[PDB]
Amino acid sequence: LIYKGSYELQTLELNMETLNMTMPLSCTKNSSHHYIRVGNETGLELTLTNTSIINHKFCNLSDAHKRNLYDHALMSILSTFHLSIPNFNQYEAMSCDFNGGKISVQYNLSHAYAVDAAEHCGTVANGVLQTFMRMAWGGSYIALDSGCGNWDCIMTSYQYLIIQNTTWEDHCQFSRPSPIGYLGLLSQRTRDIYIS
Amino acid sequence: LIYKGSYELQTLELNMETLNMTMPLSCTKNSSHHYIRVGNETGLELTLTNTSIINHKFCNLSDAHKRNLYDHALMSILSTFHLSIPNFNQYEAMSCDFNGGKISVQYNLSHAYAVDAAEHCGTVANGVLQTFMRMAWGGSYIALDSGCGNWDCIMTSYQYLIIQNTTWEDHCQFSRPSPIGYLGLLSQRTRDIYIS
Amino acid sequence: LIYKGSYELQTLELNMETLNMTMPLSCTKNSSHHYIRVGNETGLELTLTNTSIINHKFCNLSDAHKRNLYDHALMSILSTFHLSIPNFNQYEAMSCDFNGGKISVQYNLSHAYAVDAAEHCGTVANGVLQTFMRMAWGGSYIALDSGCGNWDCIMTSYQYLIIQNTTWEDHCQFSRPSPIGYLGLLSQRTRDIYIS
Amino acid sequence: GTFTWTLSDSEGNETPGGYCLTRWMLIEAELKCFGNTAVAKCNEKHDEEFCDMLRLFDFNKQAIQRLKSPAQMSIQLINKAVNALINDQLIMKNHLRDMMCIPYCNYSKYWYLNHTSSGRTSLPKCWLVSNGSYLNETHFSDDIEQQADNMITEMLQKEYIDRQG
Amino acid sequence: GTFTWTLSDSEGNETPGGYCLTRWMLIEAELKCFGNTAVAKCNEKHDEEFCDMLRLFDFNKQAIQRLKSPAQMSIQLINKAVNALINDQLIMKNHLRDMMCIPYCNYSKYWYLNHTSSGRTSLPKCWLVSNGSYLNETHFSDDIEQQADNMITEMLQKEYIDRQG
Amino acid sequence: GTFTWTLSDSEGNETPGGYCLTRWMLIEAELKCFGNTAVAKCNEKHDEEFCDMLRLFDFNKQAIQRLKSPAQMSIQLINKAVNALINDQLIMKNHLRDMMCIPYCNYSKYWYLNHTSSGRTSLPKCWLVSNGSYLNETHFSDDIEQQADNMITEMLQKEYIDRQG
Ligand SMILES: *[C@@H]1O[C@H](CO)[C@@H](O[C@@H]2O[C@H](CO)[C@@H](O[C@@H]3O[C@H](CO[C@H]4O[C@H](CO)[C@@H](O)[C@H](O[C@H]5O[C@H](CO)[C@@H](O)[C@H](O)[C@@H]5O)[C@@H]4O)[C@@H](O)[C@H](O[C@H]4O[C@H](CO)[C@@H](O)[C@H](O)[C@@H]4O[C@H]4O[C@H](CO)[C@@H](O)[C@H](O)[C@@H]4O)[C@@H]3O)[C@H](O)[C@H]2NC(C)=O)[C@H](O)[C@H]1NC(C)=O
Ligand SMILES: *[C@@H]1O[C@H](CO)[C@@H](O[C@@H]2O[C@H](CO)[C@@H](O[C@@H]3O[C@H](CO[C@H]4O[C@H](CO)[C@@H](O)[C@H](O[C@H]5O[C@H](CO)[C@@H](O)[C@H](O)[C@@H]5O)[C@@H]4O)[C@@H](O)[C@H](O[C@H]4O[C@H](CO)[C@@H](O)[C@H](O)[C@@H]4O[C@H]4O[C@H](CO)[C@@H](O)[C@H](O)[C@@H]4O)[C@@H]3O)[C@H](O)[C@H]2NC(C)=O)[C@H](O)[C@H]1NC(C)=O
Ligand SMILES: *[C@@H]1O[C@H](CO)[C@@H](O[C@@H]2O[C@H](CO)[C@@H](O[C@@H]3O[C@H](CO[C@H]4O[C@H](CO)[C@@H](O)[C@H](O[C@H]5O[C@H](CO)[C@@H](O)[C@H](O)[C@@H]5O)[C@@H]4O)[C@@H](O)[C@H](O[C@H]4O[C@H](CO)[C@@H](O)[C@H](O)[C@@H]4O[C@H]4O[C@H](CO)[C@@H](O)[C@H](O)[C@@H]4O)[C@@H]3O)[C@H](O)[C@H]2NC(C)=O)[C@H](O)[C@H]1NC(C)=O
Ligand SMILES: *[C@@H]1O[C@H](CO)[C@@H](O[C@@H]2O[C@H](CO)[C@@H](O[C@@H]3O[C@H](CO[C@H]4O[C@H](CO)[C@@H](O)[C@H](O)[C@@H]4O)[C@@H](O)[C@H](O[C@H]4O[C@H](CO)[C@@H](O)[C@H](O)[C@@H]4O)[C@@H]3O)[C@H](O)[C@H]2NC(C)=O)[C@H](O)[C@H]1NC(C)=O
Ligand SMILES: *[C@@H]1O[C@H](CO)[C@@H](O[C@@H]2O[C@H](CO)[C@@H](O[C@@H]3O[C@H](CO[C@H]4O[C@H](CO)[C@@H](O)[C@H](O)[C@@H]4O)[C@@H](O)[C@H](O[C@H]4O[C@H](CO)[C@@H](O)[C@H](O)[C@@H]4O)[C@@H]3O)[C@H](O)[C@H]2NC(C)=O)[C@H](O)[C@H]1NC(C)=O
Ligand SMILES: *[C@@H]1O[C@H](CO)[C@@H](O[C@@H]2O[C@H](CO)[C@@H](O[C@@H]3O[C@H](CO)[C@@H](O)[C@H](O)[C@@H]3O)[C@H](O)[C@H]2NC(C)=O)[C@H](O)[C@H]1NC(C)=O
Ligand SMILES: *[C@@H]1O[C@H](CO)[C@@H](O[C@@H]2O[C@H](CO)[C@@H](O[C@@H]3O[C@H](CO)[C@@H](O)[C@H](O)[C@@H]3O)[C@H](O)[C@H]2NC(C)=O)[C@H](O)[C@H]1NC(C)=O
Ligand SMILES: *[C@@H]1O[C@H](CO)[C@@H](O[C@@H]2O[C@H](CO)[C@@H](O[C@@H]3O[C@H](CO)[C@@H](O)[C@H](O)[C@@H]3O)[C@H](O)[C@H]2NC(C)=O)[C@H](O)[C@H]1NC(C)=O
Ligand SMILES: *[C@@H]1O[C@H](CO)[C@@H](O[C@@H]2O[C@H](CO)[C@@H](O[C@@H]3O[C@H](CO)[C@@H](O)[C@H](O)[C@@H]3O)[C@H](O)[C@H]2NC(C)=O)[C@H](O)[C@H]1NC(C)=O
Ligand SMILES: *[C@@H]1O[C@H](CO)[C@@H](O[C@@H]2O[C@H](CO)[C@@H](O[C@@H]3O[C@H](CO)[C@@H](O)[C@H](O)[C@@H]3O)[C@H](O)[C@H]2NC(C)=O)[C@H](O)[C@H]1NC(C)=O
Ligand SMILES: *[C@@H]1O[C@H](CO)[C@@H](O[C@@H]2O[C@H](CO)[C@@H](O[C@@H]3O[C@H](CO)[C@@H](O)[C@H](O)[C@@H]3O)[C@H](O)[C@H]2NC(C)=O)[C@H](O)[C@H]1NC(C)=O
Ligand SMILES: *[C@@H]1O[C@H](CO)[C@@H](O[C@@H]2O[C@H](CO)[C@@H](O)[C@H](O)[C@H]2NC(C)=O)[C@H](O)[C@H]1NC(C)=O
């Protein structure tokens, strides 16, 4: 407790919720449910599941923009997420449907029967999980089957990552809110592409 | 004047024109006329007007490059400007015509009858003005109808932004020349795009 | 040797080869042969020659990705190299053929009869040499006909730059291995494009 | 005035010194005030997690008091402002440490030394986490001991020159 | 030699010290010379508007004396050189301050303190502007007073240790 | 513990101090150890070529001892890690100097001063090259002399305050 003479060790813990009107805040409820607050009233829900909700592959992105019915904050976040997924060319893995400006995005990952493998390093499933790990950094560690991997060969038991617009309800029982995940993604984004 | 003891407050003002052979310099003549020196002899004129000069929408960019008749410094600046305009997908707003390598670029902004509104935040007109504000930073403040907005919902009375190649004639009666506008744009550029 | 009192000038030279398992290392054998180690066993050979090896222009990049038969480290390096070539739109200058995942890339430069000229500043040949100069920085200086140019108007006697996958054989007789060339390219990459 | 970091945008200070953290900045424990001597370290120190949080909090305050006019939804300001608010290098260091099972800062908890004989406090340092939890006080013992030495050293240097003339 | 900032590329200095600003760098007032002690602060200080202007001016000089051969139109060099010449973070801070009606630096005018008893001068600081004009000397009074204290402190510290042995 | 630069990720130090360079880090000359006083300068100094090499070497070690599991081919880690390991601004300065026929650092060779009366050594500085070779010791004479003065100054300051109480 007391170091050297009379220097007492003291602590402080920060309340990052007061930053919700200027910055989005990520938090975790449990291993399959992660959230982003994007303002005082609303946010995004990120779910790791075994059930698809989108059964087509149109992903009507250009039409969402022409119609302009979506919330812009939510769209900026989705763009940041997507742009940062390294080496994503496999568009058949992504499906979205902005019906009425509603946001619903699904990433279908090839979480194959990798009982004992380190092959699934060069795949889409890894690229999507990497972005996820950063967005929910600090709570995302319980979402994976593995531990201290290099995040460049990580796997989970779940097959789909579904991102949807929600109403904020303070679902942060596992990890506290923090702006770091998003800010740390904005700073780099599109630095993993292949043209040669 | 004299602080504490004998410390006299002194000043210096910098002459940034001596930097014209290495860096472009932006300055302002009045609210509708802004300029960029791009070398010792030539530059660009940026005019905020109510009169269009281009009455078509071809914007023959790829042909300008195949022909290669344009000055490269001027083209690099135009590219930087354009690339930095956030969320620009609305190509019908832009028209250009590089006839003989001449540079003439027009941005047609939807400066609607926004007598009392804060709707024109998510529009093209705002995205173009934002880039403008930075390029002519330090003089651009008189170009707008509004004051300390967040530059993410600003409007002007003018409908077109026209950029043309000119001969440098020292048209800097409102604000002094400075390399900062351009350098401060080069440093960031393409950091506002939407794919999701 | 001894400065002021008893301060002796001492030196150290670093062995950067021990970094080969974490970072690629560039080195030079002679003026026409430059190498990149990309791991403990393999690397890339970069040759400046007067003989083409690819006599077509298909450059089957998208098929290389669909097949996924290539080494990923080698491909990441090729992407970085290519992306960093400024103003490259002249795709007819590039040809590649990833037969079986093998890497063979050829850049055909217009090294015209520039006996006495400073015209070849705005060309492809210069853009490709610029990237080359950085990748083999520290040894690349002997690859050029000219000296302290601004690397924005440099020429060589050679017409082709050929990049191929090799086996590492310690071909570093002219300049020592160093990670700097590559790291210094990763940091900037795609900062020279024209859209206007 | 005193600070050159983001706070300086509007002078700030809040009080004569210490750039006090209010009860809504902290989780419990009401208010905490530091000395200008420690807070001012953020004027020069770039790579420090505590200083970055102060920069973000002060930004949030300024962005609410001022410029509250743009439909009260300028949540996008940060997309550019961030370049001037935080050191993303720190974020990368913490991500790398996480990948390697190296204790890392998740930015929620900080520790500092408080000289009970004066009220002088150090700039807070991040309490690190590893394997889902916080590290024990027995870890960091070298860092805690060094901060205590640093505080002692500054007190002595100040008196050697400024107390004694 | 003395400086580590851009000037160091070719040693620079110009004179035995002070990295003198010539009559074409300034608007009126002929020449101004600073002390090495103040100029050298730019060796460590990254986020300072005055230091960035010095970096750009020295670059411009070097890019004219040397490497004048590329058709005398290497106006594009700066597109890459800028990364090594200025702190774009400062530019962002000044843009943010502008948006919020916070006085900001537009880089044209600087102030410094000149000790009339010695000729020792401080490193210049940016004179700020707000609402289309320059702020009055009554503003900044805290900053001017602090710079005067800082100059006093350095003079004293130098004598305490180096004058007295 | 002592260092805050990359080394701090796993405390490091290697020995009680000096962050010793092993025989495989150097070309010949077996081992070299520095003092904590000099190595620690990299805690604050960002734009120094020697410090960046130390950051890369320590990273390489950590990335081999730990996290050796990802098929032993995580050669791609650096594509992101680099942002937290080196100052790319230095790389740009050296490229600019090369273009202008200004001696530049190619990162292979460094020099330092060694006080033969104590074993105290300075942080190494880059030996520069120009026109395909290394510069002579007659060049840099101003820089070598300044480093010798700096070492003298630190020795004196330490004794003035800490030896004498
Ligand atoms: C950096 O790393 C550190 C180290 O991991 C992270 O620190 C952790 O952060 C979390 C999130 O804040 C802390 O969780 C909180 O723990 C409280 C105490 O839990 C225990 O006691 C209570 C007593 O009632 C038991 O009920 C609990 O057991 C139940 O909950 C756990 C949850 O994990 C389940 O696993 C169990 O099976 C039980 O179901 C524990 O024994 C806990 O009370 C608190 O939960 C409330 O608050 C949250 C957030 O506001 C609400 O979402 C939640 O619904 C609860 O809210 C109700 O109750 C409060 C009571 O005060 C009312 O005020 C509300 O209105 C409402 O009615 C939460 O689970 C965790 O303790 C902490 N770990 C350590 C070691 O410190 C940092 O977050 C991380 N930083 C970042 C940025 O990532
Ligand atoms: C950071 O912010 C600060 C704060 O705003 C900016 O500071 C301002 O910068 C401008 C631009 O340099 C300064 O403007 C100059 O003011 C001179 C004085 O003007 C007054 O006196 C003259 C006396 O003759 C009157 O004629 C003027 O009135 C007329 O002009 C104003 C212009 O705004 C009109 O509004 C009026 O209606 C009148 O028409 C004023 O009463 C002024 O002389 C000077 O103009 C000459 O120089 C410029 C630039 O070289 C020429 O373009 C212009 O044509 C003039 O040149 C002729 O005259 C000179 C005489 O010396 C000859 O040498 C030439 O060859 C030629 O014949 C200019 O308008 C402004 O004063 C200053 N404000 C403050 C508070 O300090 C910084 O710029 C900004 N920094 C950055 C980077 O943005
Ligand atoms: C920053 O800038 C500086 C300044 O330019 C660069 O410094 C240079 O770096 C190079 C590369 O390491 C140094 O080259 C080495 O020089 C050795 C000595 O050469 C002289 O003596 C030998 C005696 O046998 C002669 O044979 C040589 O002549 C022959 O080689 C030269 C090569 O350029 C030809 O031009 C001649 O025509 C001759 O053919 C010279 O007179 C030299 O021994 C060494 O070569 C061996 O090592 C390399 C690398 O490992 C092998 O690739 C090569 O095949 C040789 O290896 C055989 O021999 C060794 C013997 O020890 C065995 O151990 C091996 O197993 C194998 O059998 C190499 O050429 C150069 O001296 C140095 N310049 C200065 C001024 O210091 C920095 O690199 C640069 N930094 C960066 C990052 O770019
Ligand atoms: C998401 O982010 C927002 C932004 O930070 C947070 O909202 C802030 O919450 C705090 C705490 O509730 C607010 O501060 C308090 O405001 C009370 C109301 O008066 C203010 O607001 C009215 C307009 O509604 C103004 O006219 C008035 O002038 C004030 O500005 C004050 O009464 C409070 O002071 C008194 O009570 C407190 C105890 O609650 C005592 O400690 C005080 O000493 C005093 O007696 C206090 O000032 C703050 O104003 C809110 N900001 C905004 C912009 O609305 C959200 O809380 C956050 N979400 C979560 C979950 O934290
Ligand atoms: C756009 O940017 C350019 C680049 O900075 C500026 O051009 C510089 O302008 C200054 C001031 O006029 C020049 O400096 C002066 O040059 C005179 C001419 O001699 C030089 O040039 C010839 C070749 O033309 C060389 O052979 C010779 O060796 C010199 O290098 C000198 O005579 C001047 O010195 C004398 O007169 C001045 C008063 O004018 C006195 O103060 C001196 O003490 C001395 O008696 C002086 O050296 C500089 O050379 C120009 N640079 C270039 C590259 O040409 C432009 O001015 C700028 N645009 C604007 C509007 O500012
Ligand atoms: C996720 O976002 C969608 C919107 O894309 C939310 O559902 C829909 O939200 C709109 C408002 O944006 C509701 O419109 C309402 O229409 C009535 C007239 O019929 C009008 O009186 C109301 O004032 C309002 O404009 C729409 O009804 C609503 N859809 C449904 C089925 O209720 C959705 O709720 C968001 N998801 C979550 C979890 O919050
Ligand atoms: C998410 O991606 C997986 C693949 O990683 C998809 O599963 C695959 O679906 C195809 C059909 O589209 C299966 O092929 C064949 O289908 C016919 C029925 O049409 C069946 O009779 C054949 O025997 C065969 O199964 C393929 O085997 C299956 N792959 C695996 C590993 O099961 C999945 O449908 C995608 N989910 C969504 C929502 O898009
Ligand atoms: C904006 O740029 C255009 C060029 O794109 C400038 O107009 C034209 O400039 C060219 C030179 O680039 C002039 O060419 C001349 O041709 C005669 C032969 O007919 C030759 O003897 C000259 O040496 C030169 O090569 C062209 O005549 C000129 N166009 C006109 C109508 O005069 C334009 O002036 C620039 N705008 C401003 C305001 O400076
Ligand atoms: C710049 O953009 C504005 C729109 O923001 C353009 O003005 C719009 O022009 C269309 C015609 O292309 C007008 O629609 C209709 O035109 C017919 C004539 O063909 C007329 O009989 C109809 O009554 C109707 O006006 C549209 O109303 C008009 N919008 C506004 C707000 O006035 C403008 O032409 C563009 N400028 C350039 C140079 O492209
Ligand atoms: C440059 O890369 C190519 C590969 O793209 C290297 O050539 C080929 O490498 C593959 C292995 O990647 C060899 O495959 C072998 O097949 C036999 C069965 O026939 C199997 O038993 C072996 O274990 C192995 O899988 C392939 O034979 C080889 N091609 C030739 C003609 O030998 C090429 O060698 C690399 N270049 C350099 C200079 O190293
Ligand atoms: C690399 O690029 C150069 C151009 O910079 C290519 O050389 C050019 O090749 C064309 C033919 O494709 C030559 O045009 C004509 O070809 C016919 C034969 O089909 C001949 O009868 C005509 O007299 C004429 O030569 C063109 O002149 C030639 N350019 C030069 C400067 O020699 C070269 O083939 C490209 N290399 C590769 C591997 O693609
Ligand atoms: C914005 O933040 C305020 C609090 O700062 C929220 O206020 C709550 O509103 C509900 C009614 O919808 C009341 O029952 C609560 O008591 C209020 N909370 C407090 C602390 O007073 C508000 O709901 C938030 N969202 C919006 C859209 O304004």
Author numbering:
A (entry chain B), B (entry chain A), C (entry chain C): 59 to 254
D (entry chain b), E (entry chain a), F (entry chain c): 259 to 423
Sentences from the paper on this structure:
We focus on LASV lineages of public health concern including lineage II, one of the most common lineages that circulates widely in southern Nigeria; lineage V, which circulates in Mali and has decreased pathogenicity compared with lineage IV; and lineage VII, a newly described lineage isolated from a nosocomial infection in Togo with comparable pathogenicity to lineage IV. The resulting soluble constructs feature sequences of circulating lineages II (LII; strain NIG08-A41), V (LV; strain Soromba-R), and VII (LVII; strain Togo/2016/7082). Combined, these approaches enabled us to determine the structures of GPC in a reproducible manner and yielded structures of LIV, LII, LV, and LVII GPC trimers at resolutions of 3.8, 3.7, 3.7, and 3.1 Å, respectively. LII, LV, and LVII each have an additional PNGS at residue N271 or N272, though this site is uniformly unoccupied. Similarly, when comparing the GPCs of diverse lineages, we observe high structural homology. Using the prototypical LIV GPC as reference, we note RMSDs for pruned and all sequence-aligned pair as follows: 0.78 and 1.9 (LII), 0.85 and 2.0 (LV), and 0.73 and 2.4 Å (LVII). The main differences among the GPC lineages are found in flexible loops, most notably the loop (residues 166–181) extending from the β7 sheet prior to the α3 helix. This observed heterogeneity is derived from areas in the EM map of poorer local resolution, insinuating greater flexibility of the residues in these regions. Consequently, these differences may not represent physiologically important conformational epitopes for LII, LV, and LVII GPCs.
